[PDB]
Amino acid sequence: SEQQERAFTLGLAGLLGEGVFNFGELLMHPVLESLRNTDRQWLIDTLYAFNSGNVERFQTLKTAWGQQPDLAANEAQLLRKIQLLCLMEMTFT
């Protein structure tokens, strides 16, 4: 329960700062995803948008639904990350 509120801010803050361009490498790691099962499900479904996604336009908005603060400055920025996430996938898929 302490780590299910860890992934609460871990998924948020890790998504907030864009200094890390990938951020999705180890996001499938088993020990963190066991916390992502107990964690709020809509936060994980929008994490899969940045993990795979990308759009999924409803999910990238969902992170702005539940948690209002700290996402106001990075909103238009996280709208940019999903725009560069499709460029690599559509040729990869």
Add this chain to the structure above:
Amino acid sequence: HGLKGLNSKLLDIRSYLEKVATGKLPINHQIIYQLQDVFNLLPDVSLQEFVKAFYLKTNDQMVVVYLASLIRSVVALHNLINNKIANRDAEKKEG
């Protein structure tokens, strides 16, 4: 290069399918698919996606066939002429 290249292709792709089945981990991660996608600069799959490399395909064979046509012409002129010369000089002048 096709044998040793594509046998490890089949040995690994069968073990990579085995991953989902059993033996997980290795996840790997991530090295497996990463350089596989570097292999993906050209797949090459159906069909070859060579529409830009099609005219360039034969265009690389352009001069290779031209020289092979040009060399064999004069190499013959060196081989055919000189052989006929030296042959009849010895052959008919002896008898």
